[PDB]
Amino acid sequence: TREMRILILGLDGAGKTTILYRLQVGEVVTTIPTIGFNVETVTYKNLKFQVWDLGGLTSIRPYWRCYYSNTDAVIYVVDSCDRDRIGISKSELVAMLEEEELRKAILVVFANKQDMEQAMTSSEMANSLGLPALKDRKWQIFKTSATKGTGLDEAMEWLVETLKS
Amino acid sequence: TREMRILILGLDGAGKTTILYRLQVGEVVTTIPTIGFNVETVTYKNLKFQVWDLGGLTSIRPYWRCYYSNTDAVIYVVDSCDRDRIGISKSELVAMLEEEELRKAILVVFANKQDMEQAMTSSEMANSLGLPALKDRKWQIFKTSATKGTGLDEAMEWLVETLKS
Amino acid sequence: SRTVDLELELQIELLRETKRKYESVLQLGRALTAHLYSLLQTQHALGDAFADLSQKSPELQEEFGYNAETQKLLCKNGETLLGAVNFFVSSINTLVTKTMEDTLMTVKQYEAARLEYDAYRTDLEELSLGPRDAGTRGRLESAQATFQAHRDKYEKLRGDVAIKLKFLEENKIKVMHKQLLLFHNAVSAYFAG
Amino acid sequence: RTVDLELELQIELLRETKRKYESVLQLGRALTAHLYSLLQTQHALGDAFADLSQKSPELQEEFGYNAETQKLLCKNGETLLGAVNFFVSSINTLVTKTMEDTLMTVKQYEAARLEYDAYRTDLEELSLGPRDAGTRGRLESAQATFQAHRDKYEKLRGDVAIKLKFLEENKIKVMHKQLLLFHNAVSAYFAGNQKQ
């Protein structure tokens, strides 16, 4: 019943800001690259959220952790079309999860941009992120399209219901 | 300090309605014959006035007396440039002052249309109407023009002055 | 007895009904005016806040700046409309609480004479079908005079009402027209600015 | 010194600008409640007029087009109310979630400063104070515990600095977009009424 905190994280271009305003108004909006953060109060199935969407550009990333305090769940957005950089995404994923400020947080990976033909399978992503290695941590990886809208509801459903238990 | 009831009376086309709204909004307005009455609340010298403006057409002259109740003063307007109808103006004035619901009523006579070239002198009208031959009635006659604005403040100040005593 | 009183009570009814209706319009009108009054005072305060924030914050100054103009402007115009609404209020009020009240002063006297007309109509009938004696023939005649006396009172004031309704309806329509017009024009003028 | 005071100044600005964003907020919500009222009455005055229009065609049109306007003004104010509220909600987020988040760091920076100076006070007292066969024991104690609380302060002076820069960046973006959406909404209202 309390206002819960969500962080949207991932590399520049994943589709972070688009996930947010999709959550806010059920729509695609125009976005600019996020210099710092966007932050909006959002409600989904009678559950108040304080969503912090941080920028994923290289110079921004070392400061993500200035915002990990009192976080209930992390939406991890990853470009399904960016094989070259998935390694970096793992680096950032491995790093953040080691922070104790995040110990009680639920992880929901958004395999975004799945609407594209070339898009990676969830399986390739799951290995490249090293998710099978994550024990003692409730997580999930969903195939989403922030522009089309597909996957988003199911992912948030799982996120809400798990945050209630 | 109490609200006073004023009746504007006189023959048709004398300028009764022009006067009314000149006392209300200080302007010259376009007017039509008053088929009945006009009524406005008018503040002057911090004194409230319920002002009534009855039409001068023969049709509605014998019905003036219908509205004589609770009248504090009667402003009787007479056209100064209407020498062919002053005899009519007198008999209707006299016939009014014979009424008993106007016992306390203060007579104020407006010699209207003084801005006109052939306009009568204040003297010759006053004699014609029979103002000097009146028993137990406070009367005063003033040179006025609703088109110009002359002789209104004077007339109204005298009118207020008398009601305060 | 007559058709006039039947047609008159009908119109009396309609006058009373439409009075309360205008008092509602008047009520709601003054509510709106007070509403508008509040609005402008806030608009002024918000204009000045936006204005101050514009002068202290160079990084955002244009954004607060033109927001401060717009609020300030809206009150300046509001303060104008507020006047017009008020002028609508009092004019209607004059029609309602003064002009027609004058007619109702007379309407009551009309009824006062009517009730009197009937109580003296009874006396005449109670005596014309009662017993006879010294104090019957003499009594019916002084009933007749008083019956006829109040008849005259009733007849005259019936005539007087018909006049005051006839002159009300005309004047009512004038004021109403002119006010419902200067009301509407004031609303549109407000947006025009 | 000037790197420290330069920070305190920045905090003072934020503390000053928070209060001013709250006033704009008070008045904003006051204006929405005001409008809400003004709207409800416009419904009532609308309906009232129409009744007079139909039931008394002595003056049907005079009463007619007023009820039209009063009814038109309702739905427009209804749209505008949504926008003002949207503005209220979003400003509430900036002022009472985003601002505060940085302030919660400001507190911890101020508290870390308090321990830094305390342990600093202590080390120099054991430096200026009396001597015996035990002072050196607690001298090295006072050193390590000053060295630590320095780093504690250093770490948090870093944090506040960043949050403020990241804050300034966000606040600009939000204020801008929120202010023009507020303005554009006021436009579309009068224009939405001008069209009719």
Ligand SMILES: Nc1nc2c(ncn2[C@@H]2O[C@H](COP(=O)(O)OP(=O)(O)NP(=O)(O)O)[C@@H](O)[C@H]2O)c(=O)[nH]1
């Ligand atoms: N085809 C497709 N395009 C998407 C999808 N999600 C986002 N995009 C596109 O990706 C671009 C970047 O979106 P944005 O949300 O701003 O990315 P970001 O993760 O916020 N980047 P940053 O870290 O720089 O803020 C936009 O042009 C948007 O149209 C998706 O699911 N499919």
Ligand SMILES: Nc1nc2c(ncn2[C@@H]2O[C@H](COP(=O)(O)OP(=O)(O)NP(=O)(O)O)[C@@H](O)[C@H]2O)c(=O)[nH]1
């Ligand atoms: N020169 C001049 N013309 C006047 C003056 N007052 C009225 N008039 C003229 O007389 C016209 C009618 O005036 P009005 O006030 O309507 O007269 P009234 O006494 O109301 N007529 P009624 O009794 O029939 O309603 C005006 O339009 C104007 O042309 C005045 O002081 N000077």
Ligand SMILES: [Mg+2]
């Ligand atoms: Mg972004």
Ligand SMILES: [Mg+2]
């Ligand atoms: Mg007239």
